[PDB]
Amino acid sequence: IRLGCNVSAPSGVLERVKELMEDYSRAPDAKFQQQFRHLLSVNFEEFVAETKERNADLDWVNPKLDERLQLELGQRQLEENAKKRLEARKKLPTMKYADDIIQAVRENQVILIVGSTGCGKTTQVPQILLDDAISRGCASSCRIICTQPRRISAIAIAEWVSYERCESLGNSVGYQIRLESRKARERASITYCTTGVLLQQLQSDPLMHNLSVLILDEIHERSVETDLLMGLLKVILPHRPDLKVILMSATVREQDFCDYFNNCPMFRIEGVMFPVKMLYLEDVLSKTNYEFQKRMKHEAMIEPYLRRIRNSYDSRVLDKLRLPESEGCEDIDFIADLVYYICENEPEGAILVFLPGYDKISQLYNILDKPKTSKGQRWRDHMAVFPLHSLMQSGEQQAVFRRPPAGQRKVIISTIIAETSVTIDDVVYVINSGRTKATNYDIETNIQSLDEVWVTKANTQQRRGRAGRVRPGICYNLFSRAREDRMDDIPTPEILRSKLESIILSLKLLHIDDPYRFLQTLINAPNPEAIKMGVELLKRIEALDQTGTLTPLGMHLAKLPIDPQMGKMILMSALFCCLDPITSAAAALSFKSPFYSPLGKESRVDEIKRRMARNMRSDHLMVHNTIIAYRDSRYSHAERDFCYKNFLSSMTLQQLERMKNQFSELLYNYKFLASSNCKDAASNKNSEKIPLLRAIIGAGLYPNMAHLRKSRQIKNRVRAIHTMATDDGRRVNFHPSSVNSGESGFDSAYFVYFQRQKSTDLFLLDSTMVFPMALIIFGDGVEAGVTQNTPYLCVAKTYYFKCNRETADVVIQLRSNLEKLLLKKALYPAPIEENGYEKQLIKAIELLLSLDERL
């Protein structure tokens, strides 16, 4: 056991804290409390009964409206902007199965529609069921909800279906996503929403009385939310005999969903796609005859294969398969050659290249742009080459989606983003390197890693389809068919890779109180040891009690659309009057960063971030300064150039702002704020006290701490070697994308972080420098004692600091009062009065935290 810096406090400060805690201690309307005990009192049977009576709107119908809509629909299908829009609908494969679908839904509570790209299931099935109900004089009883995994899908599909009915958005079809909705009319309507929206709406409607039909789309993708929702459907559907659910899926392990709903009827609907034929590594080498020159366990795989194709391909080609380097994207000059080849033969169309990530995308972009081969300089000005990556701007721009300039061929170098999320139309050739990146959690070592892995069979199929939108194409797979038989069917369903604290907490608000029993019923049960880690984290931040029952704090946390830790940090910012910068920190962690990472500008992005960090040594405060600067450029009508100069996505920035206000409105509705504006002066009297902000941030990211021990100033220009290790002892560093990477001379040696992850070493993706006293006040594992002959005060029983007894005894009594205050604020929420008993304890905490302000 070692000993850290002294945290004893001056006597005058100690005496004023004592006065203020004694003032706090001589203090003597909660609908929320009654709500909370009421949730805890009812068993599941009473829960259902109460929700049936509470959500009763669809027990009511409008016969004069039924009749009106039935009439105008009959009329509008004799007019000629419809009845042309109807011919082109009847060209879709799904419309041929219309009448069977109507009847199959009528006879079964659950059906499944399976169909490939082009089958129109997503646009047609909701219209089929709606127009049917309208024509039968049942309009007002019909409310259809169709889920989508991605926000952009929910918008575009809704817009298209609305056009297909000669309506503007918001009449019979609408959409709802986070913080943005063009809502449909109440009844006889179709609404497209992202799955999360429907999950959150269960809090009020836990058995789905406010919709008549639920369509789940894209379930084959096995997102957490669709996997969650089907599990909840097994609980909901026994009490909802009238509800109709339509599962919808691509042709990837379609049988599992069918099996899971015990055997329900399954439609298979043909697609509309132009033929894309697959080549593999043997076939590409035969047309290109590139030559490679500048464990195995490889040839164990490839040699048995090599010989049953002995007489089908040339002798020199099957030599190059022997090289482990031929498969994947290890040799970028090979893929470069295959792009050069497609430009020559193989008439005109765009080339879509799927590479694993940013680093390797950059290597091929430079080869394509500044080539050292003679053949490539021939092609350089006759390609228009776009990279494609979530962190790069090209996606949010018009060009990559449009056809190239005359005499130019378009080449797109992309990550998996172009498989389903981003879609380009004039692709005819796909180069599928077969390599992608993935995050895996090793439950035993608490190490998240980012590893390069092979794609699955399903992925490769999806990439093939991206060539067959406009005309027939070709898909070049840079691996042998011996590899494809090594590949998995699907990616690992993401429920198995995820932290579970959020779901377990959310389940309690649906009166699913046993997360082990319920989660075991999903299509793939998560590891029960990952459930225990979830419950444990929730017990530690005090959202669940020791027995595992919900606490008043946890119910609030469950009602915030954000992870429970950052929820708690957002909440703390309300009681401690630093609302604006903390919700910026929260929003940027829950969402992504507003900074692009354009190619070749890695050096300059680092300067921009350091400059916006304002030497405050926190990746989180750095985002808030960015938001403060962004608002100012809107006040100066200089937004575009501010965004240009500093590589900022105005789109993510504006969404971060909408998230900040959502948090404000919720905390305001929950009686924690006097004002719903996250910039209100009253909610922000403390927002420039930097030591205070590190304390509230630490209260959120705790217990994820690191301690730094080393220096360097020799001698290149500006870099330093760190010796740093997390609370568990493992040696870490700041990720190069962090503003603290390579920095020197820190006012404190301790940091908190949101994500640790190993790619080339164990990195902290984001950090904020914290001070020990702040950790001690908001953390746990705090005891005072004597170890060498020295009095100490510790945190997490891991970091021990010299501390005299007078300071320790006061800090310990202070933490006691802090816990008492948090416990009441959760049960009996109210804003903290500016001149009350509760403010005196707050002033006690600010007083101790300010002792660390930089002189």
Partner DNA sequence: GGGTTAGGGT
Secondary structure E strands in 456-547: 473-477
Residue whose CB is less far from DNA, 432 or 687: 432
Give the Cα-Cα-Cα angle 557, 562, 568 (nearest 5 degrees).
45
Residue whose CB is less far from DNA, 200 or 677: 200
565 phi and psi angles, rounded to 5 deg: -65, -55
Is residue 656 at the binding interface for DNA, with CB under 7 A as the rule?
no
337 phi and psi angles, rounded to 5 deg: -60, -40
- Segment contacting DNA by CB under 7 A, of 331-339, 401-409, 430-438, 773-781: 430-438
Residue 503 CB, shortest distance to DNA, in Å, is 9
Residue whose CB is less far from DNA, 719 or 820: 719
Is residue 179 at the binding interface for DNA, with CB under 7 A as the rule?
yes
Per DSSP, the residues of 807-852 read HHHHHHHHHHHHHHHHHHHHHS--PPPTTSHHHHHHHHHHHHHGGG
Residue type, 774: A
638 phi and psi angles, rounded to 5 deg: -115, 35
- Segment contacting DNA by CB under 7 A, of 138-146, 265-273, 754-762, 774-782: 754-762
Selected binder of DNA within 138, 391, 496, 796 (CB under 7 A): 391
Is residue 86 at the binding interface for DNA, with CB under 7 A as the rule?
no
DSSP H stretches of helix in 278-373: 281-288, 299-308, 317-320, 332-344, 358-369
Residue 282 CB, shortest distance to DNA, in Å, is 28
Instruction: Kindly determine how many residues on this chain lie close enough to bind DNA according to the rule CB under 7 A.
Output: 64
Residue whose CB is less far from DNA, 93 or 170: 170
Is residue 330 at the binding interface for DNA, with CB under 7 A as the rule?
no
After which residues does a break in the chain occur, C–N more than 2.5 Å? Answer: 28, 294
Polymer length in residues for the chain: 855
Residue whose CB is less far from DNA, 286 or 393: 393
- Phi-psi map region of 700: left, alpha, beta (phi>0 left; psi -120 to 50 alpha): alpha
Q: Are 820 and 25 in contact (CB under 8 A)?
A: no
Is residue 178 at the binding interface for DNA, with CB under 7 A as the rule?
yes
Is residue 767 at the binding interface for DNA, with CB under 7 A as the rule?
no
Selected binder of DNA within 25, 35, 77, 204 (CB under 7 A): 204
Is residue 323 at the binding interface for DNA, with CB under 7 A as the rule?
no
- Phi-psi map region of 647: left, alpha, beta (phi>0 left; psi -120 to 50 alpha): left
Selected binder of DNA within 143, 165, 389, 624 (CB under 7 A): 389
The number of C-alpha atoms within 13 Å of 726 and in the hemisphere containing its C-beta is 23
Closest by CA to 189, choosing from 246, 145, 125, 240, is 145
Residue 558 CB, shortest distance to DNA, in Å, is 7
| Burial class of residue 760 (count of CB atoms within 10 Å of its CB; 0-12, 13-18, 19+) | exposed
Selected binder of DNA within 116, 171, 363, 597 (CB under 7 A): 597
Residue whose CB is less far from DNA, 732 or 810: 732
Is residue 171 at the binding interface for DNA, with CB under 7 A as the rule?
no
Residue whose CB is less far from DNA, 737 or 767: 737
Is residue 660 at the binding interface for DNA, with CB under 7 A as the rule?
no
- Segment contacting DNA by CB under 7 A, of 91-99, 364-372, 522-530, 598-606: 598-606
Selected binder of DNA within 217, 501, 563, 743 (CB under 7 A): 563
Is residue 176 at the binding interface for DNA, with CB under 7 A as the rule?
yes
Selected binder of DNA within 326, 432, 662, 684 (CB under 7 A): 662
Is residue 700 at the binding interface for DNA, with CB under 7 A as the rule?
no
Is residue 480 at the binding interface for DNA, with CB under 7 A as the rule?
no
Other Cβ atoms less than 10 A from the Cβ of 204: the count is 11
Rounded to whole angstroms, the Cα distance separating 678 from 672 reads 12
555-568 in b/e form (b: 16+ CB < 10 A) is bbbbbbbbbbbbbb
Is residue 559 at the binding interface for DNA, with CB under 7 A as the rule?
yes
Strand, coil or helix: what is 448? strand
The residues of the shown chain that bind DNA, judged by CB under 7 A, are 149-152, 176-179, 181, 194, 196-197, 199-201, 203-205, 223, 356-359, 389-391, 415-417, 421-422, 436-439, 450, 494, 502, 506, 559-563, 590-591, 597, 602-603, 605-606, 662, 666, 719, 721, 735-737, 741-742, 759-761, 763
